[PDB]
């Protein structure tokens, strides 16, 4: 929606940055199951 | 249409003879400290040069007590004259 | 007139009242007329 402020920013704007910082590591966490293939090659090359 | 006309006078008649009721200003008395915007005058976090941003409020319809009760604004623009479903109590509308 | 938007002093539109009122813009046109359903508020149009 983006901020529509009657005068408010105490909750709206404040928690907008907090939610943005919650979302971004959670995407990496969810994509981490597909990332298991690249980690398998990474440990193999180091083990060699 | 005729009912909407009788509903133009409703607040004016209600405020003396039912007493109370006031419509004020959206901005409120306490002034604390204004909170940040990206450098002043923008539409990204204000409405423009229009308004200002402080605290959390939106309320305009609320009634003062002052040192003596009954204080009423002489003109009101908040809600426009319209009709709809029949409710003669708030709790009847709360269910519906 | 328009080739620029946003440089952090943004006002899209605000009324000209000057020193004393009873003045207006002489370019009273940036808009074309149109006919649609009954709207007696911004809110009514936002619902439909």
Swiss-Prot record, chain A:
It comes from the Viruses. It is found in: Virion. Coiled coil: none annotated. Forms the portal vertex of the capsid. This portal plays critical roles in head assembly, genome packaging, neck/tail attachment, and genome ejection. Procapsid assembly may initiate with a nucleation complex composed of portal and scaffolding proteins. The portal protein multimerizes as a single ring-shaped homododecamer arranged around a central channel. Switches upon genome packaging from an asymmetrical conformation in the procapsid (PC-portal) to a symmetrical ring in the mature capsid (MV-portal). This change of conformation may serve as a signal for headful packaging. Homododecamer. Interacts with the terminase large subunit; this interaction allows the packaging of viral DNA. Interacts (via C-terminus) with the head-to-tail adapter protein gp4; this interaction participates in the head completion. Interacts with the scaffolding protein; this interaction initiates procapsid assembly, thereby ensuring incorporation of only one portal ring per capsid. Interacts with the capsid protein. Belongs to the p22likevirus portal protein family. This is Portal protein. It comes from Salmonella phage P22. The gene is 1. The chain holds residues 582 to 629 of 725 of the full protein.
From Swiss-Prot, chain B:
Coiled coil: none annotated. Belongs to the p22likevirus portal protein family. The lineage of its organism: Viruses, Duplodnaviria, Heunggongvirae, Uroviricota, Caudoviricetes. Homododecamer. Interacts with the terminase large subunit; this interaction allows the packaging of viral DNA. Interacts (via C-terminus) with the head-to-tail adapter protein gp4; this interaction participates in the head completion. Interacts with the scaffolding protein; this interaction initiates procapsid assembly, thereby ensuring incorporation of only one portal ring per capsid. Interacts with the capsid protein. Forms the portal vertex of the capsid. This portal plays critical roles in head assembly, genome packaging, neck/tail attachment, and genome ejection. Procapsid assembly may initiate with a nucleation complex composed of portal and scaffolding proteins. The portal protein multimerizes as a single ring-shaped homododecamer arranged around a central channel. Switches upon genome packaging from an asymmetrical conformation in the procapsid (PC-portal) to a symmetrical ring in the mature capsid (MV-portal). This change of conformation may serve as a signal for headful packaging. This is Portal protein. Transmembrane segments: none annotated. It is found in: Virion.
